[PDB]
Write a protein that binds this ligand. Structure first.
Ligand SMILES: Nc1c(-c2nnn[nH]2)cnn1-c1ccc(Cl)cc1Cl
Ligand SMILES: Nc1c(-c2nnn[nH]2)cnn1-c1ccc(Cl)cc1Cl
Length: 263
Protein backbone atom coordinates (compact mmCIF):
# COMPACT_ATOMS: atom_id res chain seq x y z
CA UNK A 1 0.00 0.00 0.00
CA UNK A 2 2.94 2.37 0.53
CA UNK A 3 4.46 2.28 -2.97
CA UNK A 4 3.27 5.81 -3.82
CA UNK A 5 4.81 7.34 -0.69
CA UNK A 6 7.98 5.30 -1.24
CA UNK A 7 8.23 6.54 -4.83
CA UNK A 8 7.91 10.15 -3.68
CA UNK A 9 10.66 9.59 -1.10
CA UNK A 10 12.85 8.06 -3.82
CA UNK A 11 12.34 11.14 -6.01
CA UNK A 12 13.23 13.41 -3.08
CA UNK A 13 16.34 11.32 -2.41
CA UNK A 14 17.39 11.40 -6.06
CA UNK A 15 17.22 15.21 -6.15
CA UNK A 16 19.11 15.49 -2.83
CA UNK A 17 22.24 13.67 -4.00
CA UNK A 18 22.41 11.82 -0.66
CA UNK A 19 20.96 8.75 1.03
CA UNK A 20 17.66 9.02 2.90
CA UNK A 21 16.18 6.65 5.48
CA UNK A 22 12.62 6.92 6.81
CA UNK A 23 10.49 4.94 9.23
CA UNK A 24 6.96 5.84 10.33
CA UNK A 25 4.81 4.06 12.91
CA UNK A 26 1.16 5.13 13.15
CA UNK A 27 0.21 4.07 16.69
CA UNK A 28 -3.52 4.05 15.96
CA UNK A 29 -3.15 0.78 14.06
CA UNK A 30 0.64 0.01 14.00
CA UNK A 31 0.81 0.60 10.25
CA UNK A 32 4.18 1.69 8.94
CA UNK A 33 6.09 3.30 6.09
CA UNK A 34 9.71 2.32 5.50
CA UNK A 35 12.26 3.77 3.08
CA UNK A 36 15.71 2.17 3.37
CA UNK A 37 14.27 1.06 6.70
CA UNK A 38 16.89 -1.65 7.30
CA UNK A 39 19.95 0.28 6.09
CA UNK A 40 22.36 1.66 8.68
CA UNK A 41 22.85 5.38 9.22
CA UNK A 42 25.08 7.29 11.66
CA UNK A 43 22.92 8.41 14.56
CA UNK A 44 24.95 11.47 15.60
CA UNK A 45 23.11 13.40 18.34
CA UNK A 46 19.92 11.34 17.95
CA UNK A 47 21.77 8.80 20.12
CA UNK A 48 21.29 11.21 23.04
CA UNK A 49 17.73 9.89 23.40
CA UNK A 50 19.00 6.39 24.18
CA UNK A 51 21.52 7.67 26.71
CA UNK A 52 18.99 9.88 28.52
CA UNK A 53 16.46 7.04 28.50
CA UNK A 54 19.00 4.63 29.99
CA UNK A 55 19.62 7.05 32.87
CA UNK A 56 15.86 7.39 33.33
CA UNK A 57 15.70 3.60 33.59
CA UNK A 58 18.39 3.68 36.31
CA UNK A 59 16.35 6.32 38.14
CA UNK A 60 13.44 3.90 38.49
CA UNK A 61 15.36 2.19 41.32
CA UNK A 62 17.13 5.34 42.65
CA UNK A 63 14.63 8.10 43.51
CA UNK A 64 17.42 10.65 44.00
CA UNK A 65 19.55 9.76 40.97
CA UNK A 66 18.36 12.63 38.77
CA UNK A 67 19.38 15.06 41.54
CA UNK A 68 22.89 13.58 41.80
CA UNK A 69 25.62 16.14 41.03
CA UNK A 70 28.25 15.43 38.41
CA UNK A 71 31.48 17.43 38.33
CA UNK A 72 32.23 19.41 35.17
CA UNK A 73 35.93 20.15 34.66
CA UNK A 74 37.62 22.30 32.00
CA UNK A 75 39.03 19.17 30.35
CA UNK A 76 35.49 17.78 29.92
CA UNK A 77 34.43 20.41 27.39
CA UNK A 78 34.21 19.06 23.86
CA UNK A 79 33.04 20.62 20.60
CA UNK A 80 29.67 22.22 21.52
CA UNK A 81 28.78 22.69 25.18
CA UNK A 82 26.37 25.63 25.51
CA UNK A 83 25.09 24.51 28.93
CA UNK A 84 28.03 22.61 30.39
CA UNK A 85 30.48 25.47 29.86
CA UNK A 86 28.47 27.55 32.35
CA UNK A 87 29.15 24.88 35.01
CA UNK A 88 32.88 24.27 34.57
CA UNK A 89 34.56 23.85 37.98
CA UNK A 90 31.03 23.24 39.27
CA UNK A 91 28.42 20.53 38.89
CA UNK A 92 25.25 19.63 37.00
CA UNK A 93 22.68 17.09 38.12
CA UNK A 94 21.86 14.10 35.95
CA UNK A 95 18.48 15.74 35.23
CA UNK A 96 20.26 18.93 34.13
CA UNK A 97 22.65 16.91 31.96
CA UNK A 98 19.74 15.02 30.39
CA UNK A 99 17.84 18.22 29.64
CA UNK A 100 20.96 19.88 28.23
CA UNK A 101 21.81 16.89 26.02
CA UNK A 102 18.27 16.53 24.70
CA UNK A 103 17.02 20.10 24.42
CA UNK A 104 20.26 21.93 23.50
CA UNK A 105 22.27 19.02 22.03
CA UNK A 106 25.08 19.69 24.54
CA UNK A 107 27.88 17.23 23.78
CA UNK A 108 29.64 17.43 27.15
CA UNK A 109 26.31 16.58 28.78
CA UNK A 110 26.03 13.52 26.54
CA UNK A 111 29.48 12.37 27.63
CA UNK A 112 28.43 12.59 31.29
CA UNK A 113 25.36 10.45 30.53
CA UNK A 114 27.55 7.90 28.75
CA UNK A 115 29.95 7.81 31.70
CA UNK A 116 27.06 7.33 34.14
CA UNK A 117 26.15 4.20 32.12
CA UNK A 118 29.72 2.84 32.14
CA UNK A 119 30.70 3.87 28.62
CA UNK A 120 29.16 3.56 25.15
CA UNK A 121 28.54 -0.16 25.67
CA UNK A 122 26.28 0.61 28.61
CA UNK A 123 24.04 2.57 26.26
CA UNK A 124 24.03 -0.38 23.84
CA UNK A 125 23.22 -2.75 26.72
CA UNK A 126 20.17 -0.65 27.59
CA UNK A 127 19.07 -0.75 23.96
CA UNK A 128 19.26 -4.56 24.03
CA UNK A 129 17.33 -4.68 27.31
CA UNK A 130 14.41 -2.83 25.71
CA UNK A 131 14.36 -5.03 22.60
CA UNK A 132 16.55 -3.06 20.17
CA UNK A 133 19.04 -5.48 18.58
CA UNK A 134 20.27 -2.93 16.02
CA UNK A 135 21.38 0.21 17.89
CA UNK A 136 25.07 0.39 18.69
CA UNK A 137 27.00 3.13 20.46
CA UNK A 138 30.75 2.69 20.16
CA UNK A 139 32.32 6.07 20.94
CA UNK A 140 31.85 9.24 22.96
CA UNK A 141 31.47 12.82 21.77
CA UNK A 142 32.78 14.19 19.51
CA UNK A 143 34.11 11.19 17.58
CA UNK A 144 30.75 9.39 17.42
CA UNK A 145 29.84 11.89 14.65
CA UNK A 146 32.50 10.91 12.09
CA UNK A 147 29.66 9.34 10.05
CA UNK A 148 32.02 7.58 7.62
CA UNK A 149 30.11 5.74 4.85
CA UNK A 150 30.12 2.01 5.49
CA UNK A 151 31.32 2.37 9.10
CA UNK A 152 28.97 0.45 11.45
CA UNK A 153 30.07 2.35 14.56
CA UNK A 154 27.44 4.55 16.21
CA UNK A 155 24.69 3.54 13.77
CA UNK A 156 21.17 2.18 13.75
CA UNK A 157 18.43 1.62 11.18
CA UNK A 158 15.27 3.70 10.71
CA UNK A 159 13.04 0.71 11.51
CA UNK A 160 14.81 -0.05 14.77
CA UNK A 161 14.97 3.54 15.97
CA UNK A 162 11.29 4.19 15.26
CA UNK A 163 10.30 1.09 17.21
CA UNK A 164 12.56 2.04 20.11
CA UNK A 165 11.37 5.65 20.20
CA UNK A 166 7.78 4.37 20.22
CA UNK A 167 8.47 2.02 23.13
CA UNK A 168 10.29 4.70 25.12
CA UNK A 169 7.74 7.51 24.70
CA UNK A 170 4.37 5.82 24.13
CA UNK A 171 4.95 2.23 25.30
CA UNK A 172 6.24 0.73 28.53
CA UNK A 173 10.02 0.53 28.13
CA UNK A 174 10.20 3.10 30.96
CA UNK A 175 8.10 3.61 34.05
CA UNK A 176 5.21 6.04 33.76
CA UNK A 177 6.91 8.99 35.46
CA UNK A 178 10.09 8.43 33.44
CA UNK A 179 8.19 8.15 30.14
CA UNK A 180 6.43 11.43 30.94
CA UNK A 181 9.77 13.07 31.74
CA UNK A 182 11.26 11.91 28.43
CA UNK A 183 8.21 13.22 26.53
CA UNK A 184 8.44 16.57 28.35
CA UNK A 185 12.11 16.88 27.44
CA UNK A 186 11.53 16.04 23.76
CA UNK A 187 8.59 18.44 23.52
CA UNK A 188 10.87 21.19 24.87
CA UNK A 189 13.59 20.68 22.26
CA UNK A 190 15.02 23.95 20.94
CA UNK A 191 16.72 22.63 17.79
CA UNK A 192 13.95 21.03 15.75
CA UNK A 193 11.85 23.64 13.93
CA UNK A 194 13.67 23.27 10.57
CA UNK A 195 13.58 19.45 10.49
CA UNK A 196 10.60 17.03 10.70
CA UNK A 197 8.40 19.75 12.26
CA UNK A 198 8.84 22.01 9.21
CA UNK A 199 7.13 19.43 7.00
CA UNK A 200 4.04 18.93 9.17
CA UNK A 201 0.86 20.96 9.75
CA UNK A 202 1.67 23.78 12.15
CA UNK A 203 -1.06 22.75 14.60
CA UNK A 204 0.46 19.33 15.31
CA UNK A 205 2.51 18.90 18.48
CA UNK A 206 6.03 17.48 18.06
CA UNK A 207 8.77 16.30 20.38
CA UNK A 208 12.04 15.50 18.63
CA UNK A 209 15.79 15.06 18.82
CA UNK A 210 17.96 16.27 15.93
CA UNK A 211 21.44 15.20 15.00
CA UNK A 212 24.15 16.16 12.58
CA UNK A 213 27.70 15.22 11.84
CA UNK A 214 30.28 14.76 9.15
CA UNK A 215 29.30 13.68 5.63
CA UNK A 216 26.50 16.24 5.82
CA UNK A 217 24.66 13.84 8.08
CA UNK A 218 21.33 15.39 9.06
CA UNK A 219 18.90 13.45 11.24
CA UNK A 220 15.73 13.85 13.27
CA UNK A 221 13.64 11.44 15.35
CA UNK A 222 10.21 12.59 16.44
CA UNK A 223 7.01 11.75 18.23
CA UNK A 224 4.08 13.57 16.67
CA UNK A 225 0.65 14.26 18.16
CA UNK A 226 -1.66 15.30 15.31
CA UNK A 227 -5.07 16.71 16.06
CA UNK A 228 -7.84 14.19 15.77
CA UNK A 229 -5.82 10.96 15.74
CA UNK A 230 -3.38 8.79 17.67
CA UNK A 231 0.32 9.75 17.79
CA UNK A 232 2.90 8.92 15.15
CA UNK A 233 6.59 8.12 15.45
CA UNK A 234 8.81 9.28 12.58
CA UNK A 235 12.54 8.84 11.97
CA UNK A 236 14.33 10.64 9.12
CA UNK A 237 18.05 9.96 8.56
CA UNK A 238 20.12 11.55 5.79
CA UNK A 239 23.79 11.30 4.86
CA UNK A 240 25.87 12.45 1.90
CA UNK A 241 28.95 11.28 -0.04
CA UNK A 242 31.37 14.13 0.79
CA UNK A 243 32.94 14.47 4.24
CA UNK A 244 32.39 18.25 4.32
CA UNK A 245 28.84 18.30 2.91
CA UNK A 246 26.46 20.87 4.36
CA UNK A 247 23.47 20.02 6.53
CA UNK A 248 20.15 19.47 4.73
CA UNK A 249 17.38 19.87 7.30
CA UNK A 250 15.08 20.81 4.42
CA UNK A 251 15.36 17.25 3.11
CA UNK A 252 14.04 15.97 6.44
CA UNK A 253 11.17 18.45 6.30
CA UNK A 254 10.39 17.30 2.76
CA UNK A 255 10.37 13.65 3.84
CA UNK A 256 8.02 14.48 6.71
CA UNK A 257 5.72 16.37 4.34
CA UNK A 258 5.55 13.39 1.97
CA UNK A 259 4.65 11.20 4.95
CA UNK A 260 1.96 13.61 6.18
CA UNK A 261 0.46 13.92 2.69
CA UNK A 262 0.16 10.12 2.51
CA UNK A 263 -1.96 9.80 5.66
N1 LIG B 1 25.55 20.80 15.06
C1 LIG B 1 25.68 20.13 16.34
C2 LIG B 1 24.74 19.28 16.94
C3 LIG B 1 23.47 18.94 16.46
N2 LIG B 1 22.47 18.51 17.20
N3 LIG B 1 21.38 18.33 16.40
N4 LIG B 1 21.75 18.69 15.15
N5 LIG B 1 23.06 19.06 15.21
C4 LIG B 1 25.29 18.91 18.15
N6 LIG B 1 26.49 19.48 18.25
N7 LIG B 1 26.73 20.23 17.15
C5 LIG B 1 27.84 20.96 16.95
C6 LIG B 1 29.09 20.39 16.76
C7 LIG B 1 30.21 21.21 16.59
C8 LIG B 1 30.08 22.59 16.61
CL1 LIG B 1 31.48 23.67 16.40
C9 LIG B 1 28.85 23.17 16.81
C10 LIG B 1 27.76 22.35 16.98
CL2 LIG B 1 26.23 23.18 17.23
N1 LIG C 1 1.08 1.16 5.91
C1 LIG C 1 -0.26 1.41 5.43
C2 LIG C 1 -1.29 0.47 5.33
C3 LIG C 1 -1.27 -0.87 5.69
N2 LIG C 1 -2.32 -1.68 5.63
N3 LIG C 1 -1.95 -2.92 6.08
N4 LIG C 1 -0.65 -2.83 6.42
N5 LIG C 1 -0.25 -1.54 6.19
C4 LIG C 1 -2.38 1.16 4.81
N6 LIG C 1 -2.02 2.41 4.61
N7 LIG C 1 -0.72 2.57 4.97
C5 LIG C 1 -0.10 3.76 4.93
C6 LIG C 1 0.21 4.36 6.14
C7 LIG C 1 0.81 5.61 6.19
C8 LIG C 1 1.08 6.27 5.01
CL1 LIG C 1 1.85 7.87 5.01
C9 LIG C 1 0.77 5.70 3.79
C10 LIG C 1 0.17 4.45 3.75
CL2 LIG C 1 -0.20 3.78 2.16
Amino acid sequence: QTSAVQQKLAALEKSSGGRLGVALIDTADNTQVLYRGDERFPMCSTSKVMAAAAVLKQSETQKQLLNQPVEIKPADLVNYNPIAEKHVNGTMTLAELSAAALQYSDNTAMNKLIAQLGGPGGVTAFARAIGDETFRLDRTEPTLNTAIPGDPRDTTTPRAMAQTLRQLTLGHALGETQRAQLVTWLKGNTTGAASIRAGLPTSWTVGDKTGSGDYGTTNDIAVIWPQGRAPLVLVTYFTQPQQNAESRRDVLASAARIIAEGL
